[PDB]
Design goal:
The structure is cut from a larger assembly and holds two copies of chain A. Chain A is mostly helical and 50 residues long. Helices cover 44% and strands 0% of the residues of chain A. The two termini of chain A are 13 Å apart. The A-B interface holds A 2-5, 36-39, 41-42 and B 28, 31-32, 34, 49, 75-78. Chain A: It comes from Banna virus. Chain A: This is Vp2. The PDB classes it as virus. The entry lists the keywords reovirus, RdRp, inner capsid protein, virus.
Amino acid sequence: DTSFIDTRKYCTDGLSPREIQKALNRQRAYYDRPELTISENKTLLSQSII
Amino acid sequence: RFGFRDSPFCTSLPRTIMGNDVRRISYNVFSMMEDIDDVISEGFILYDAYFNFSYDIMTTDGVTRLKEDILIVTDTGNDIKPIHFYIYFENRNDKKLRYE
């Protein structure tokens, strides 16, 4: 990741975390809930690691 | 000292303004805050990273201003755009430039 602190090695295999993020964001749109937080984004996006 | 119009240089960043303390935010924490719009309504100090800046001094008078907007917000985090200053000298009695 482009961040300074984040030295984790994000994996590129499996079901991409971006696809899950888009699915949840569409789900939150229907219920009129706010979209995923900045802090919640990389909790989801960094689940796939090497 | 230099007679700039609305000069953007401070001798040292003030910890108190008009008797009130100034919020100090680390850059990494600043990249987290969702409610930047509410926060920026008052000042804050970013101090946890190296901030590059370039400035051009123009001899004529003009309204000192930044080249782009300060903020840029994305889904991953918030950031500060490149800092460029258009610094002009000041004539105190120019009403039109004071208004602008």
